[PDB]
Amino acid sequence: LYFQGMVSKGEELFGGIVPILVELEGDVNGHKFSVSGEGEGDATYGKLTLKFICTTGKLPVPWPTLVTTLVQCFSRYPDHMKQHDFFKSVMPEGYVQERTIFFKDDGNYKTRAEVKFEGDTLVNRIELKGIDFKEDGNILGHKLEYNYISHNVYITADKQKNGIKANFKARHNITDGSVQLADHYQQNTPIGDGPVILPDNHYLSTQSALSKDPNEKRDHMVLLEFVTAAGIT
């Protein structure tokens, strides 16, 4: 006699390959821009394949600084950690994801996003506001290298808000060989009133590989990303 355990509607939605759409509206120091992204996610392998296009012409900030803002529901949670997957637990109704990202010795991004299913498609709708940036600096002056980003996203339960908090320090290489710290603070809250998983402390080991489409004439970013939950057992 075997028992499979309860599987939620949310978890079940990620069993296969899911199409993804991303839409971002941004304003950094009064520079307005829009980004659209499309691709697919395969949570079984924690695998995301995405292409983003700046639909307003030249992106006024470096692509690498937008990666984290531009769907952690696609994380691979090991079987023994499935009871700690907040992100899938709230699907299809979804979650709000908010961040402040502090660029050391420069300005900050504040972001608000709605992540939910529209039919069979996982959608991430974002507004980004950046202020206090230097002319001038590594962000507005485009002084950041275009290559990998790899860090652990540290997650803790936020019982009082029925959600989670996360923190991590992203480190973007500068073209002079130095490093630009982007200190991330994050909160996620369910959109609906349903039951949610509040996890024990853990992290998402995340690796993003940035590339270009040789055939693409618009300002853009091709992304291959792997995300795996860890830190328990």
Side-chain angles (χ1 to χ4, degrees):
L1 182 66
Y2 302 114
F3 298 92
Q4 306 309 126
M6 297 294 297
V7 295
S8 69
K9 185 180 175 190
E11 189 182 329
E12 196 152 359
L13 295 176
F14 292 92
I17 308 280
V18 176
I20 297 169
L21 298 169
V22 181
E23 294 283 323
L24 173 155
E25 293 303 331
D27 177 326
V28 179
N29 276 37
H31 296 275
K32 295 182 184 300
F33 58 98
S34 306
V35 173
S36 295
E38 300 180 15
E40 54 185 36
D42 194 1
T44 299
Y45 306 102
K47 183 188 183 169
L48 291 156
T49 51
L50 293 155
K51 173 180 178 185
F52 300 95
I53 291 145
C54 177
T55 60
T56 48
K58 183 174 182 41
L59 194 67
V61 296
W63 279 111
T65 75
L66 294 191
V67 166
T68 58
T69 296
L70 291 163
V71 287
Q72 293 166 324
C73 44
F74 288 99
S75 297
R76 181 177 76 79
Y77 273 73
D79 179 73
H80 72 275
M81 289 178 64
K82 284 195 178 310
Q83 74 272 32
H84 303 280
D85 193 346
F86 165 89
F87 305 100
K88 289 181 192 65
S89 77
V90 297
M91 296 297 161
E93 184 138 28
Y95 55 80
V96 169
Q97 176 163 299
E98 299 159 296
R99 288 211 185 96
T100 306
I101 305 173
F102 297 93
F103 294 89
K104 185 170 170 180
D105 297 321
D106 214 332
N108 62 85
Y109 296 164
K110 292 201 179 62
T111 67
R112 302 266 191 82
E114 174 189 38
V115 186
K116 73 182 172 180
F117 277 80
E118 296 281 9
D120 295 325
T121 306
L122 189 283
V123 173
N124 182 198
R125 292 170 173 101
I126 311 141
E127 295 178 331
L128 179 152
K129 181 72 161 284
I131 65 180
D132 286 343
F133 284 92
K134 297 175 179 172
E135 324 334 308
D136 252 7
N138 296 328
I139 288 68
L140 294 178
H142 295 276
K143 307 184 180 174
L144 300 188
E145 297 284 16
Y146 184 87
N147 57 39
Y148 295 53
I149 309 173
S150 178
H151 298 287
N152 291 329
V153 174
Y154 296 96
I155 298 176
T156 68
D158 187 348
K159 181 62 198 174
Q160 301 69 26
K161 290 189 152 194
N162 206 216
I164 61 169
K165 290 168 154 158
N167 62 100
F168 51 104
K169 296 174 175 307
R171 301 172 196 290
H172 305 287
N173 300 319
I174 305 162
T175 56
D176 65 357
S178 190
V179 64
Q180 172 65 64
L181 175 65
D183 195 1
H184 289 61
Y185 298 84
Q186 171 179 339
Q187 300 159 12
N188 298 65
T189 316
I191 292 174
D193 252 350
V196 309
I197 284 169
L198 299 188
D200 292 344
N201 293 357
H202 68 283
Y203 62 93
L204 307 181
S205 169
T206 311
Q207 298 86 40
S208 306
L210 292 64
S211 67
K212 297 293 188 184
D213 172 358
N215 296 313
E216 181 56 69
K217 304 193 191 164
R218 291 167 295 180
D219 195 0
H220 72 282
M221 177 178 61
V222 176
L223 206 52
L224 171 60
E225 181 166 297
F226 292 95
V227 196
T228 304
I232 293 175
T233 305

